[PDB]
């Protein structure tokens, strides 16, 4: 809907200005207005992660994954949150899935980021 789209733009503006709590609020509205749109979940996760609200961020990334399995960013985001909460083994699994999807849908464009997350997860484990 147009109002979901306004909420996504508002979100993006708040996020851009590092106003995390207002981004959370905007993405919650995006999610209410377009509950099947994976971007709202991933986007709210991004803001919750900046707030160090990791269980919530991870739950939203999981929901984004359910709504759009080709949404590579959700996988990368989730792994990053899993590293933050020392779920290393899980992160490495999530990164394996992200690398595969990244090749399939993005033709490798996020490979560098995924490989450095993988390295970081492996070493801390």
């Amino acid at each position: 809907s147009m109002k979901a789209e306004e909420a996504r733009l508002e979100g993006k503006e708040y996020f851009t200005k590092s106003d995390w709590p207002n981004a959370v609020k905007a993405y919650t509205e995006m999610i209410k207005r377009a509950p099947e749109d994976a971007r709202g979940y991933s986007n709210r996760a991004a803001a919750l992660a900046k707030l160090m609200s990791f269980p919530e961020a991870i739950a939203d990334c999981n929901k984004a994954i359910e709504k759009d399995p080709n949404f590579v960013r959700a996988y990368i985001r989730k792994a990053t949150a899993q590293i933050a909460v020392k779920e290393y083994a899980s992160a490495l699994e999530t990164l394996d899935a992200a690398r595969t999807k990244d090749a399939e849908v993005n033709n490798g464009s996020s490979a560098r980021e995924i490989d450095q997350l993988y390295y970081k997860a492996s070493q801390q484990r």
């Binding site: 996504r8 979100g11 993006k12 996020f15 981004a23 971007r39 991933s42 986007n43 991004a46 803001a47 992660a49 900046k50 960013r73 990368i76 985001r77 990053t80 996020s110 980021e113």
Partner: peptide, 7 residues
């Protein structure tokens, strides 16, 4: 990187 990006 992803933690700096929104859609």
């Amino acid at each position: 990187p992803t933690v700096e990006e929104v859609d």
